[PDB]
Design a protein around this ligand. Structure first.
Ligand SMILES: [Zn+2]
Length: 324
């Protein structure tokens, strides 16, 4: 087909009509720094809603595959691992979502950031939706920049769960998160906790604390979005076994040594551009997460996903996952 396969041997050991069906939300983040998370020692409570969630596992030692929203995302769903990962040929490799779609799991990708980078290309166009425009995202008139909001991705998922009744389901929500240099645009007035913030076009011209405040506000918005995801998943506890996974595609630099956005090559990228937060919540002791401070990378994503849907592929039975 011109596709290079890696998991043709993959097999789902237990099916939806052998046990309770499983519904999972994978929230793909952007620009979130692990060292700006309270659970990892940050001095501000940037995730106050997740702090009150029972069964929520935080991961403090996760490193990203790359430093950009073009390099890390295809690697997050790749089978190869960042060592063997090549970005020029990633679009053509079989990835975890291809494998899961083959095994009967409903894949759904809602994107409020840019695109899937190619992860959803081999899948029918009816499974990818653009939520950056008001065409699909119902929440775009809550701020004076008229930017569509991440929580708009939650509206109308009950109908997807209804149409796919009794199916294993995986839902990727691609966050706008903490992107771009205009951090002050990324959140609504409900989250303007820290002040002042930087409105400037040039980050170098900002006062450092203003930039920090804007970034932390956007982190508050993300915290709220993840929490609302978990609540939504709770509205389906009765019929499905539910779980939520959050990873950021990379970190961000905020003036450390005059460095200000992301994008630097891994060989020279500072520590802040690769340390990302990772969260995992499950209603059920069905899955038991690995230890908090286990040293992990994006290579843990693809095993995790497979483990969630009881899939066995030969390539990734030696891999560290987020669950045991
Ligand atoms: Zn990014």
């Amino acid at each position: 087909t011109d596709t290079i396969y890696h998991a043709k041997d993959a097999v789902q050991t237990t099916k939806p009509s052998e046990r309770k069906p499983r519904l999972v939300v994978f929230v793909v983040g952007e620009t979130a720094r692990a060292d700006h998370v309270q659970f990892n020692g940050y001095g501000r409570e940037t995730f106050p809603q997740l702090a009150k969630v029972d069964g929520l596992a935080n991961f403090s030692q996760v490193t990203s595959c790359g430093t950009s929203t073009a390099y890390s995302v295809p690697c997050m769903f790749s089978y190869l691992g960042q060592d063997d990962y090549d970005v020029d040929t990633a679009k053509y490799q079989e990835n975890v979502l291809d494998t899961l779609d083959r095994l009967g799991v409903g894949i759904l990708w809602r994107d409020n950031n840019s695109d899937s980078k190619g992860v959803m290309d081999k899948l029918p166009a009816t499974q990818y939706f653009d939520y950056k425009s008001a065409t699909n995202n119902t929440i775009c008139n809550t701020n004076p920049y008229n930017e569509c909001r991440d929580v708009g991705m939650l509206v109308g998922l009950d109908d997807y769960v209804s149409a796919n009744n009794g199916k294993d389901m995986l839902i990727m929500l691609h966050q706008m998160g903490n992107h771009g240099p205009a951090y002050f645009k990324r959140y609504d007035e409900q989250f303007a906790k820290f002040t002042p913030v930087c409105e400037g076009n040039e980050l170098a011209k900002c006062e450092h604390q203003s930039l920090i405040n804007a970034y932390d506000n956007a982190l508050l918005a993300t915290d709220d979005f993840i929490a609302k995801s978990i609540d939504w998943l709770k509205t389906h506890e009765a019929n499905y076994d539910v779980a939520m996974l959050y990873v950021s595609d990379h970190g961000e630099s905020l003036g450390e040594n005059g460095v200000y956005l992301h994008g630097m090559p891994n060989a020279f990228a500072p520590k802040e551009q690769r340390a990302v937060p990772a969260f995992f919540w499950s209603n059920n002791t069905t899955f038991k997460p690995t230890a908090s401070d286990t040293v992990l990378t994006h290579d843990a994503i693809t095993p995790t996903l497979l483990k969630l849907f009881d899939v066995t592929a030969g390539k990734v039975k030696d891999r560290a996952a987020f669950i045991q």
